[PDB]
Structures are given as structure tokens and as C-alpha cells.
Amino acid sequence: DIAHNLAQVRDKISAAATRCGRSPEEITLLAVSATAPASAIAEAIDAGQRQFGENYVQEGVDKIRHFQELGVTGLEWHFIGPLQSNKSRLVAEHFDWCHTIDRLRIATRLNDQRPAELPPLNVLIQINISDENSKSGIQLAELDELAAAVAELPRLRLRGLMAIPAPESEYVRQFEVARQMAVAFAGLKTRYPHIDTLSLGMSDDMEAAIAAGSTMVRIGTAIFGA
Ligand SMILES: Cc1ncc(COP(=O)(O)O)c(C=O)c1O
Ligand SMILES: Cc1ncc(COP(=O)(O)O)c(C=O)c1O
């Protein structure tokens, strides 16, 4: 039951925030509905969920159009998969957030292909913080350059950072890696305007991500199953 899992996930989030002195409202739950059918999302929506994350463009754009013509309003769609240049038009036309900005060219395409009547696309720069087997995300030493360039684009809005750490089961390493992301985030937050989103943490490391300072956790299986 999706509505029951939603409530169970929000309990774990609220628990973890409270334990480390944070207000539960500081942590946005982003329900990762990738691979989940539109019927399952519609249940989630009925249980009050409004923020949904998708890994693949055409799957995501089809859900977006579905709930639009149903006249369902007030949703927020986040593209959280790797973004190919040949699919950026659809992200720039249909999504509200994109978490995977890791090269300036792809961000300039999104800015150019973004219709003017829409609000700027909120974007996070993705950091490869600890995953040597991943080609996704920049190194921290490139952050200031990429952030400055991306910050300039008028149809985008730089909101913060995202990382998918390498899989880790030792809580100590989970926390140390997320702290590195929280430190970079704080550093960016001082100089850049409207930096308010650290997209970090999934079910396996949710506690350490929240204790380290994440503002948004990405939960998929624990909501929709597989
Ligand atoms: C294995 C795989 N999955 C998904 C995609 C992209 O999915 P979508 O067409 O929904 O954007 C690609 C792109 O070719 C792919 O190679
Ligand atoms: C970004 C992301 N978070 C989470 C999951 C799985 O959800 P859970 O956090 O419960 O492991 C997946 C895929 O289903 C995912 O792609």
C-alpha cells in the first residue's frame, strides 16, 4: 500500500531530523517514481505526495503530460537521471527541477531550449563525491568554475548541489562523505544567492545524510516497491 509506505517514510525522515536537532520541515521528500506506473503515482498524489523524481526523460514527460490533462495541479517534477544532449529539449520543456548538471554545455542547452513563459528551471550541480565507477558528476575542485558559469544563465536557477555517493554500509563513512557535501554546500551558500537545496541521501544512508545536513532525500523502492 503506497499511502501506507509514504506515511512510514515520512516517519523515518521526521524521526531522523528530530534526533539531530533539525526541524522535520527542513527535509523535502522526493518520491522517486522511476519504473513506477502512472497509476501508482496517482495513488501517491491521492496520499498527498506532490514531488516526484524521474530517471528517464520520455518516461517522465509521458507521466507529466498524463497528470496535466487530467487537470491535476501543483506537482513538482525533478529529472534526476543523466542527461544526454539529444534529450535536453524535453527536460527544458517539461520538468521543474534537474539535479544532474555536471557540464556547462548541457546547462546552456537547457537554458536555450527553456520556453520563456515558464519559470526558470531549478538546477543542482552534481558532484561525484566518492564513486570512481561513475562518470556522472564533477569533482569539487571544478565546482566554483561551473557554478559561476551556470549561475549566469537566465532561464536556469542554481539552487545547490546533488551527489550519489558510492554504495557504503559503514555509517561512519556514510556520514563523512555526506559531510563533505554539506561543507561544499555551505561554502557555495555563502557567496551564491538562493542556494537552499542539498539533494543527498536515499533509504540506505538516509540517517547520515540528514544528520550531515541534507535538505532533500530521494526515496523510491521504500515507497513503490519494485
Ligand atoms: C539503457 C537506456 N535507458 C534509457 C534511455 C533513455 O530513456 P528515455 O527514452 O525515456 O529518455 C537510454 C537512451 O538511449 C538508454 O540507453
Ligand atoms: C535516486 C534513487 N533513490 C532511491 C531509489 C530506490 O529507493 P530507496 O531509497 O528506497 O532505496 C532509486 C531507484 O529505485 C533511485 O534511483
Give a written overview of the molecule.
By secondary structure, the chain is of the alpha/beta class. It has one domain. An eight-stranded parallel beta sheet has the order 7-6-5-4-3-2-1-8. The longest helix is centred in the last third of the chain and has 21 residues. It binds pyridoxal-5'-phosphate (2 copies). One pyridoxal-5'-phosphate binds next to α3. The site of one pyridoxal-5'-phosphate has 11 residues, from β8 and α9. It is classed as protein transport.
Give a summary of the structure in a few sentences.
It is globular and about 40 Å long. The protein has helices at 2-19, 38-46, 57-69, 88-94, 104-113, 143-151, 171-191, 206-212, 221-224; strands at residues 28-32, 51-54, 76-79, 97-101, 121-127, 156-163, 197-199, 216-219. By secondary structure, it is of the alpha/beta class.
Percent strand: 15-25%
- What is the straight-line distance between the termini? 13 Å
Q: Radius of gyration over alpha carbons?
A: 17 Å
Topology as a string of helices (H) and strands (E): HEHEHEHEHEHEHEHEH
Query: Spatial order of the strands in the main sheet?
Result: 7-6-5-4-3-2-1-8
Tally of helical runs: 9
Major sheet details:
8 strands, parallel
Number of domains: 1
Helix content: 40-55%
Assign the structural class, choosing from mainly alpha, mainly beta, alpha/beta, alpha+beta, or little secondary structure.
alpha/beta
Function: Pyridoxal 5'-phosphate (PLP)-binding protein, which is involved in PLP homeostasis.
Domain Alanine racemase N-terminal: 5-226
Modified residues (N6-(pyridoxal phosphate)lysine): 34
Family: Belongs to the pyridoxal phosphate-binding protein YggS/PROSC family.
